[PDB]
Each structure stands twice: as C-alpha cells, then as structure tokens.
Design a protein around this ligand. Structure first.
Ligand SMILES: *[C@@H]1O[C@H](CO)[C@@H](O)[C@H](O)[C@H]1NC(C)=O
Lengths: 47, 100
C-alpha cells in the first residue's frame, strides 16, 4: 500500500537514520536559503 | 621616510583605486571586482539584512557569500557558476566509436 514497497520495519529503519548527504542533483537549489548550509554544497569541489 | 600603514582585511573601505565603474550584470554568470574582492559567479538579489558597518558576508565555511554594492548599497548573494564532473560512457573502441 505504500511507495517504495518497503516492509513496516524497513520504513522504521529508514526514518530512524538521518542521512546528511543523500546524493542527487543539487545544483537547482542555488540560493534563497537562509545560508548555504553544508558537505561542500558542491561549490568547493566535493560531491 | 614616509610609511603608509593600512589593513586590507576591513571590508568597508572608502579609499583607493582609479577604476572606471560599469553597470551590474546581476543574474548572468560574470566576473566581478567589488572593492578589490575578485571572483567569478552569479549575482542575485539577497534577502539578507546587513548592519551599517558590514560590507561582506560569509557562509558556514568562512568564504564570501554576499556583498553590499559600493554605490547602491543593494545586498547581492554570490552563487558560483554551475560546474561538475564529466563522465564518458564508451562501448569500447573495438566495437563502436559512439560515446555518451
Ligand atoms: C554614488 O553616486 C550615485 C549617482 O547617481 C548616487 O545615486 C549614489 O547614491 C552614490 N552612492 C554613494 C555611496 O555615495
């Protein structure tokens, strides 16, 4: 019944762990945030 | 003997270059020189509120994030121009020379 077709236990495991990086395309974000907030935010060459 | 003593670490300078000012490009990716601070990036309207004595701002990692325009006092955010890695997908030169 839920997206990703994970078990009740797997969603619990995923909700408990906080992922700092979560790699995906991030260039679209750019500014308008309170601050850039990163872990280079790509800008310093680390992805 | 004449000794000229100054510090270049104070952002709101009021003294020193016979440079010829031009317009502000804003959104398009450009090179810039703001009171001796130079670089490449995209200048956009900022929502940040600078104090009367603050010319420059910095991000979490102490690099320049935003500037105060020397003539208009508009606060502009500086986002570096888009860049990234290039990866080459090759079937192998013994099969085909097509590349993604
Ligand atoms: C600089 O001169 C322009 C001339 O139109 C004026 O509008 C602007 O406010 C001036 N800025 C400062 C900081 O004196």
């Amino acid at each position: 019944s839920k997206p990703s077709k994970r078990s009740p236990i797997e969603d619990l495991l995923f909700n408990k762990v906080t992922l700092a990086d979560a790699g995906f395309i991030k260039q679209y974000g750019d500014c308008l945030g309170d601050i850039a907030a990163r872990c280079a935010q790509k800008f310093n060459g680390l992805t | 003997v004449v000794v000229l003593s100054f510090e270049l670490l104070h952002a709101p300078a009021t003294v020193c270059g016979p440079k010829k000012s031009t317009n502000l490009v804003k959104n398009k990716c450009v090179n810039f020189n703001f009171n001796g601070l130079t670089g490449t990036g995209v200048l956009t309207k900022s929502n940040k509120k600078f104090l009367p004595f603050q010319q420059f701002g910095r991000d979490i990692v102490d690099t320049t994030d935003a500037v105060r325009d020397p003539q208009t006092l508009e606060i502009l955010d500086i986002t570096p121009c888009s860049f990234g890695g290039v990866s080459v997908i090759t079937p192998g030169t013994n099969t085909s020379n097509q590349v993604a």
